[PDB]
Design a protein around this ligand. Structure first.
Ligand SMILES: NC(N)c1cc2c(O[C@H](c3ccccc3)c3nc(-c4ccccc4)no3)cccc2s1
Ligand SMILES: [Ca+2]
Lengths: 54, 235
């Protein structure tokens, strides 16, 4: 598993570890979900999200 | 926006409108509660510019609006209209008082230089603003939006006698009809990624509107990511 294919399955950002693995990570306002892949809100109103239910 | 669609309230809560000599002469995107990123050509000296966030209908009262004054304006240091009118067309507006954030007033995300480029290459971004809705007619009451495809660089150079720099990209449809337009300038080009939108461009210029063979030209934000983050820091 690397960042080469499907962004390491990282929803936002992926960086190659030295152990031939992927460490995923998020943008500001977000935290890595217990998934270790998705990015979930870590603040009340994080950037780039629609939160008025459409 | 020519050939757009009505935005829903809360659909683009990073969008702001700019008031100056006339109301809604330009658009913007929220970087954070204290800062707004817009286009540099929208900055004319002597003009007090007022920023309005949480806007949907430009002549009604949603009671989601937050209006602020611009105390400091930082156009990009390489930007200079007398050398080129729209190269480095990006600028930061500092608000006197922080915006109070909610579902209607929410920042746009900004990745690093690399991921902003990657996200640009997804090939499709949502453009928005209250600019003209017909090539020469009238400005918009409700916030318009449009999902524009990335146009290839070689293809874009062929389209114009004017100079497209490496600080620019092009987006739009080959056979016209639908485009950003005058008044939309400084509004965001965003790319959505698994529910999260990321700022990939600034609406900047173009030769006429929605015309065949002519594409919109947007500021390549990836080239200015490091600058935006240096200047807009919070404490
Ligand atoms: N994505 C697009 N197509 C855009 C066009 C456009 C604009 O257009 C000018 C305009 C259009 C319609 C009505 C009034 C003014 C315009 N600018 C130009 C032009 C021509 C030659 C060189 C540079 C700019 N032609 O038109 C002014 C401000 C922003 C944008 S974005
Ligand atoms: Ca309103």
């Amino acid at each position: 598993m690397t960042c080469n294919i499907k962004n390491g399955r990282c929803e936002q950002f992926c960086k190659n570890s030295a152990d031939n693995k992927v460490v995923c990570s998020c943008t500001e306002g977000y935290r890595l979900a217990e998934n270790q892949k998705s990015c979930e809100p870590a603040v009340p109103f994080p950037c780039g999200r629609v939160s008025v239910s459409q | 926006v020519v050939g757009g669609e009505d935005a829903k309230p809360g659909q683009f809560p990073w969008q702001v409108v700019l008031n100056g000599k006339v109301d809604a002469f330009c658009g913007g995107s929220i970087v954070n509660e204290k800062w707004i990123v817009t286009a540099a050509h929208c900055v004319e000296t002597g003009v007090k510019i007022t920023v309005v966030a949480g806007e949907h209908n430009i002549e009604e009262t949603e009671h989601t609006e937050q209006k602020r004054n611009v105390i400091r304006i930082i156009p990009h240091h390489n930007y200079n209209a007398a050398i080129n009118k729209y190269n480095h067309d990006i600028a930061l507006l500092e608000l006197d008082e922080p915006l109070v954030l909610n579902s209607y007033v929410t920042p746009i995300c900004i990745a690093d230089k690399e991921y902003t480029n990657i996200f640009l290459k997804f090939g499709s971004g949502y453009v928005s603003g209250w600019g003209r809705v017909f090539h020469k007619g009238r400005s918009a009451l409700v916030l318009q939006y449009l999902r524009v495809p990335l146009v290839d660089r070689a293809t874009c150079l062929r389209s114009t006698k004017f100079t497209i720099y490496n600080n620019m990209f092009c987006a739009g449809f080959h056979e016209g009809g639908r485009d950003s337009c005058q008044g939309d300038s400084g509004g965001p080009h965003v790319t959505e990624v698994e529910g999260t939108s990321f700022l990939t461009g600034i609406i900047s210029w173009g030769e006429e509107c929605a015309m065949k063979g002519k594409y919109g030209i947007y500021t390549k934000v990836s080239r200015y990511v490091n600058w935006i983050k240096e200047k807009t820091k919070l404490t």
